[PDB]
Design a protein around this ligand. Structure first.
Ligand SMILES: CC(C)(COP(=O)(O)OP(=O)(O)OC[C@H]1O[C@@H](n2cnc3c(N)ncnc32)[C@H](O)[C@@H]1OP(=O)(O)O)[C@@H](O)C(=O)NCCC(=O)NCCS
Length: 273
């Protein structure tokens, strides 16, 4: 009698192996897989069951308001309390790739911003970031995730950039919840670096900390840490600034050479509560 662990989830054409254990309320059997509907995120122990529900009539995108939509991606804002089932399913899926995550069942305190890539086939959920409706620490991101099958394609940086656009619209600085996984912290460091580098080349050769936080919603701490790492911190005109140098120009051009997609602030149709 085999009592197997969840060793693989079948999502669309993808067969993904979890990185960590997730509390799916499922029976342990001699099989080690479950089906995850790529639209509803519902889990099924049998292909037949999955098929049975797949036929049902359902929307083909996350259950929320589309507050951003460009030719590349869309962002749906979902209130956990309004979509408990879907969001709980999202959290269970997310935990498979997180060392730790708050109780998956309690989604009410969160707002989920889910990003989809649109193809000739429609919407495809590629990642998301949750956010406390009320954060005592001012965290502008609780958890953030790019589904495994879509990682290392630039989606993570888009998720992060979007979280800062919300903060900017809210007229507040913000920073991701600590502690961050190594993957998460390294992604933020790259984003913060790319952001200061782009500002120095496209906005001004010299910029004060205040100006930076005002334009990016990045906190003083994340700005200083990033500036020190790049060796671009100085004192000019009576205050601390970051400055441009050949290294930064070089980095900027290399960044641009990758012709990466970015978020257009003008397409965010959203008003904070
Ligand atoms: C952290 C996380 C969101 C990052 O998401 P991601 O989609 O992989 O992020 P990005 O793709 O924007 O990261 C940039 C990387 O992708 C690579 N990349 C992006 N587009 C690419 C392309 N078209 N071709 C080749 N490489 C590409 C970049 O070269 C870069 O590699 P590097 O970090 O070694 O320099 C993701 O690793 C994840 O969900 N991890 C598990 C959950 C987790 O730990 N979340 C954070 C909790 S604190």
């Amino acid at each position: 009698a085999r009592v197997r662990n969840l060793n693989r989830i079948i999502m669309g054409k993808y067969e993904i192996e979890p990185w960590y254990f997730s509390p799916y309320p499922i029976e342990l059997t001699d099989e080690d897989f479950i089906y995850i509907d790529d639209f509803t995120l519902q889990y099924f122990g049998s292909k037949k069951q999955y098929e049975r529900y797949r036929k049902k009539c359902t929307l083909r995108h996350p259950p929320g308001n589309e507050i951003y939509r460009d030719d590349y991606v869309s962002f749906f804002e979902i209130d956990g309390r309004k979509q408990r089932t879907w969001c709980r399913n999202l959290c269970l899926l997310s935990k498979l790739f997180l060392d730790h995550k708050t109780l998956y069942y309690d989604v009410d305190p969160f707002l989920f911003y889910c990003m989809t890539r649109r193809d000739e086939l429609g919407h495809h959920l590629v990642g998301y970031f949750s956010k406390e409706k009320e954060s005592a620490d001012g965290y502008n991101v609780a958890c953030i995730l790019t589904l495994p099958q879509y990682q290392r394609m630039g989606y993570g940086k888009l998720l992060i950039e979007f979280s800062y656009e919300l903060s900017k619209k809210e007229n507040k600085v913000g920073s991701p919840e600590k502690p961050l996984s190594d993957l998460g912290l390294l992604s933020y460091r790259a984003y913060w670096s790319d952001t200061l580098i782009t500002l120095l080349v496209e906005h001004q050769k010299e910029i004060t900390i205040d100006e930076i936080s005002s334009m990016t919603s990045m906190t003083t701490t994340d700005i200083l840490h990033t500036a020190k790492t790049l060796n671009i911190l100085r004192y000019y005109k009576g205050q601390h600034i970051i400055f441009l140098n050949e290294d930064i120009l070089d980095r900027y051009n290399r960044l641009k050479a990758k012709k990466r997609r970015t978020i257009d602030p003008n397409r965010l149709i959203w008003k904070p509560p």
